[PDB]
Design a protein around this ligand. Structure first.
Ligand SMILES: NC(=O)c1ccc[n+]([C@@H]2O[C@H](COP(=O)([O-])OP(=O)(O)OC[C@H]3O[C@@H](n4cnc5c(N)ncnc54)[C@H](OP(=O)(O)O)[C@@H]3O)[C@@H](O)[C@H]2O)c1
Ligand SMILES: NC(=O)c1ccc[n+]([C@@H]2O[C@H](COP(=O)([O-])OP(=O)(O)OC[C@H]3O[C@@H](n4cnc5c(N)ncnc54)[C@H](OP(=O)(O)O)[C@@H]3O)[C@@H](O)[C@H]2O)c1
Ligand SMILES: NC(=O)c1ccc[n+]([C@@H]2O[C@H](COP(=O)([O-])OP(=O)(O)OC[C@H]3O[C@@H](n4cnc5c(N)ncnc54)[C@H](OP(=O)(O)O)[C@@H]3O)[C@@H](O)[C@H]2O)c1
Ligand SMILES: NC(=O)c1ccc[n+]([C@@H]2O[C@H](COP(=O)([O-])OP(=O)(O)OC[C@H]3O[C@@H](n4cnc5c(N)ncnc54)[C@H](OP(=O)(O)O)[C@@H]3O)[C@@H](O)[C@H]2O)c1
Ligand SMILES: [Zn+2]
Ligand SMILES: [Zn+2]
Ligand SMILES: [Zn+2]
Ligand SMILES: [Zn+2]
Lengths: 352, 352, 352, 352
């Protein structure tokens, strides 16, 4: 009944809450491994989605089922499961339109640490267990598995939105844990040249590991003119935004060729307007499609990504640089996300 | 020959130029019916695509072939043809990528009054007659046929970009001649409710004629607040932008539901940045796809829209509010586009 | 209660069954109007999908909600509803893949008169009311509304699967009620020339009403020869199959041009294989895509087709050639579908 | 000029022909490396596309440009180039419709050893050199590069047509060179499990090399049965057909789940019809899309596959099991393609 929660905007700390009870279709899960996200920094310290009061944080968890509702059919207590960060209500009009990420409202499929208590507690509540849980194979280590709920689905969704054709040249703007899975996702969509944009040397090494053929550091100059030289004025076929300020939107439109695609998965927390360059967008007519999506969730998304991990299509363990232990280290791993060490990509806290 | 040209930014007038000469694959066409476009106002008086010097204007024309190159197979002198605004070079890498509008560079398939002398002349040059001309059936009048090169393909391209599903609710921002064709295109994509946004009474009558079920005038208040009341907070499935300043882009994102599409065909002439509202775009994750395209051209595009007029799927003659006559009246119709009268939609100058 | 049921393969009759009770998410409906389907002839007399025992027939119904479950939120007793022919279980993996029509197994989204008691009873059961019912606007009469559950969604799905481009030439093979809605559907996707294939004058008249520009009589001569002559050897951009024997598949492949689409919504009830002509399929390489699909259902599909009726995009009332009053005439209307007289398109029974 | 030609159906031999001259847009190329194809066996010995007289065989070649026309702007004599098997005329309506493979008619984008003298001569003619040749980087050896013109673009086209989603389970029916590249192609689309169906031990090794996770031998029982056991009766998300008689079409339909795709790239050379099984295709309604395509060609396609080789995304040299050198050994390699020894995958003849 203890959990690390967001007291208000700019203030965090442990609180005490009632242990959640499952509905007939729900499950209660105790976490075996969790991970903090930059998104919890964007909501706490930037108030990007408004004010909260005593909301448990955290949304990336592999856990063990301890209680199921009278209608749960595919999960028993004791089952080890990968919980997706997006756990929608599956009976809404948006699902019938094909957008479960927005089931019941904009971004409403994202429930943990948004409009529902997160996984940073001795237990948490997963709604619609048969639809929003996936069994964890015994062959996948806990550290790699906890990268599936959020980092892998978001990074891969960026590659999916980019509509990569075989052999296409892809740029990945941002090589944090999300952008690194975007680099992997691009390679899984059969990209040829993958140009990664970042600075931290631990991120640059992992980007090459996941298939980046070129590294672009802003120290050499503006990223726009730097990538344009790599492409001899042609540009990239797609640019995946996985970090940066609102101005990175303008950088993306400038480096993508006409007919190319700008695929955003970045959570912009500050700024009122995301700039789109009029001239580099063809004054409205360059066919530079812009996409920006919340990562898919639910049981099928996790099962699909479990197979990709299982059959060795992507190894997410290289995202995990720091492994803590014990509930108390949740606060420390969370604070590592506010001020990132230079040797950090993604921390993981193991609990049992 | 003589032709109405853009002397410099902000100055137009008639000039003297040699009659153009065709290559083995090209044709020389004399115009039978022409029409001016708002796009030529954006370039002349706003300098939206840079400076020009003595460039004949005009890109909407129905003509008669007067000379063909030794390699033209399908067109003879004396053929009456619909000339598209977009006449790309068809042997480029962009065409192999599937974006003929950008063959040779951004917007480079748009040649007339962009990088080439336009149709406001005694003759004009059409590159690759076999690929960029369509035969005009005797059953379609000159006034209806001259709407096909630019207005119809652009409006229909807005509806194509919008990814309309059967029964979807569509908003069209701007009900000038392009937006009027976007209301028609929306209906031809099977839209249910079509909410048109405009004020001019002549345009509103035409909007209803082409399918609009609701008329939104800014007089009642903000367009965003007005459309949200019409849809009980849900919004529209797609929004076609066919006019307005750079702020209309923000309006379209605010009124489109998550997972919807913003389809822009407006030529933005002023401002550096098209604003995209961070919050109403889901902070980057609302799956509100943004598109913006130059209208398709070439022979096949024209033949397909010719069939749409022939089989009575759309009557573009209702766009034509003014019918001038004589080469001299081209200057009259062009300035008539800088300050649109309240009873104007689209003017047409008949020549022979 | 009373109900018109499939006793066994080849025999139908009135039986006695228990009035269904709703689960927490379900509703009980009494029908106000019903219609019989050719699909129930395939099931009973051809045994097309196997034996059945005491299954009430029928899957096209508009009704009145009489009872709802404790969890039903959007529908109360007294509400007049349009009931889709397809009412899937929405919490399955197939829904997460995007194929609700096969929720639980192939064709399993189709419940009425497949794996569940149909609507030809004093009451029927609708699983998951909030997801599988739509409100009926008072402006839409009963006869028209009952064309929405199955005829309109199936025929429109043919047009959806055909991937119709603006101005394309489309052929519709079979112009019973489903094919007539495929003609209308092709019009709602922007088809130019629509070539309808059939012989019965009542259907030919309706096909012209719904937009057919050409009528091909299959008893007049070979369909393939006739359509090639009409298209000057080019073929059509798409052929929608809405009737005929297995060899209509070969006819469709033979008339579609390379890169075109064959879109089947016909329920084939006899024969081991459907033939694809090797040579006219380009020996496997002609890019003639073949689709075949169960019509969409659920609340959203009904609501979108209701808007197409409400805003007068389609008037399905011309499909109704026979209207009867009274429960016992369910038998008469059903045998009408078996006998298929020359003046029949679709019969409706009013129980109001 | 000497050349290995198809004299008539069932007979091949060396003939003498005049050395071709190029049009103003064309190039004459001398082969540095060539490879024979199973498709030529279908053509010569089954007559799958009719009778030919003294047609030089072969459509797989890397060569040196020896002469160009006056309008060729990107290639000079001495340039080493990858020549695609498909070299269409790019100025046709089919290119405008988006299908260069059928430019001028069904399969007409495939010219070499179809409607044009092939690459098995001292020189050959490439039409439209600027559009249909790709520069060959010095880093790619000749034997691997000659897998790009046909094997790689066909197998990858199968993965493209299969509409593969991340993590999906894919079956590849047939693992000769085309099927092995479909295995690599499926991996480049992000497939999870990949079930290869073959029996020759050398092909099984290569299939495991390119990413197969499961091997089904059509000797341990029916393919359909075994694959259903591997998938627990669920089936595969897509099946790529790359070999087999006409019955393989029925096999593919029986193993694909509802909503999945059957993607054929096999050249069927015998049989009047390809059987589609009525029940397992849902009596017409299972949403099992069937595609079948001639492989893409042209400059842009070769360039993108060159990049996938250059950046080490795929290594096609494992396809090459026999390398000879000498013009005369074209006959030797071709006959190996007829009577396929169990250690053969693809032979290559080196000429310089
Ligand atoms: N849509 C979803 O479902 C979803 C899910 C999770 C997270 N997100 C959001 O997506 C973003 C990425 O997640 P994350 O955990 O990987 O954050 P992160 O660790 O902070 O990575 C941000 C990256 O952006 C780089 N960067 C900073 N300024 C840049 C600039 N001008 N140009 C290019 N790159 C620049 C940084 O490079 P260096 O640090 O090396 O200098 C860094 O690598 C976050 O904002 C997150 O909130 C979205
Ligand atoms: N992509 C292409 O291929 C292509 C082709 C041709 C043209 N275009 C461009 O697309 C645009 C449409 O062409 P057009 O000839 O129809 O121009 P137009 O006659 O000036 O029509 C512009 C429409 O926008 C309305 N409008 C003005 N302010 C607005 C606001 N805040 N919000 C919403 N609507 C507002 C106007 O309403 P009222 O006038 O009734 O007050 C008018 O109906 C032009 O800019 C044109 O240059 C693009
Ligand atoms: N996928 C779904 O969800 C769904 C839904 C409902 C129904 N269906 C099925 O789709 C089909 C259409 O239903 P329906 O009520 O419209 O049946 P219908 O009235 O019997 O329509 C049959 C049409 O096919 C014509 N026909 C027969 N042989 C032909 C041939 N060799 N060539 C060309 N046309 C031929 C018939 O000609 P005539 O004009 O002379 O009769 C008629 O026009 C049925 O089989 C039905 O079971 C599928
Ligand atoms: N779409 C295009 O552009 C294109 C391009 C090139 C070629 N093709 C054609 O595609 C096909 C593949 O080419 P290829 O060079 O790879 O020929 P191949 O080596 O003969 O491929 C045959 C493969 O299919 C297997 N096979 C035979 N019958 C089978 C059955 N009932 N079930 C399952 N597998 C069966 C064979 O088994 P074994 O292992 O025992 O031999 C072998 O693995 C050829 O027909 C070719 O002409 C098409
Ligand atoms: Zn996160
Ligand atoms: Zn214009
Ligand atoms: Zn039916
Ligand atoms: Zn081949």
């Amino acid at each position: 009944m203890k959990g690390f929660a967001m007291l208000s905007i700019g203030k965090v700390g442990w609180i005490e809450k009632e242990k959640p009870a499952p509905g007939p279709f729900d499950a209660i899960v105790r976490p075996l491994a969790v991970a903090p996200c930059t998104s919890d920094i964007h909501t706490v310290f930037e108030g990007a989605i408004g004010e909260r009061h005593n909301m448990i944080l955290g949304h990336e968890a592999v856990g063990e089922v301890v209680e199921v509702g009278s209608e749960v059919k595919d999960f028993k207590p004791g089952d080890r499961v990968v919980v997706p960060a997006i756990t929608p209500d599956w009976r809404t009009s948006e699902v019938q339109r094909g957008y479960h990420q927005h089931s019941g409202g904009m971004l409403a499929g994202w429930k943990f640490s948004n409009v529902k208590d997160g996984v940073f507690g001795e237990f948490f509540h997963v709604n619609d267990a048969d639809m929003n849980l996936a069994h964890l194979p015994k062959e996948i280590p806990l550290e790699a598995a906890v990268m599936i709920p959020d980092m892998m689905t978001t990074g891969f969704h960026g590659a999916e939105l980019a509509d990569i054709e075989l052999g296409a040249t892809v740029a990945v703007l941002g090589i944090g844990p999300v952008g690194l899975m975007a680099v992997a996702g691009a390679k899984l969509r059969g990209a040829g040249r993958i140009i990664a944009v970042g600075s931290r040397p631990v991120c640059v090494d992992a980007a090459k590991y996941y298939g980046a053929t070129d590294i672009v550091n802003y120290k050499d100059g503006p990223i726009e003119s730097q990538i344009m030289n790599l492409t001899e004025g042609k540009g990239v076929d797609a640019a995946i935004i996985a970090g940066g300020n609102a101005d990175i939107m303008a950088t993306a439109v400038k480096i993508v060729k006409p007919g190319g695609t700008i695929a955003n998965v970045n959570y912009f927390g500050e700024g009122e307007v995301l700039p789109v360059p009029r001239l580099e967008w063809g004054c409205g007519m360059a066919h530079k499609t812009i996409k920006g999506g919340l990562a898919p969730g639910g049981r099928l998304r996790m099962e699909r990504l479990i197979d990709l991990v299982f059959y060795k299509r992507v190894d997410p363990s290289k995202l995990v640089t720091h492994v803590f232990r014990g509930f108390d280290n949740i606060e420390k791993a969370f604070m590592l996300m506010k001020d990132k060490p230079k040797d950090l990509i993604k921390p993981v806290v193991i609990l049992a």
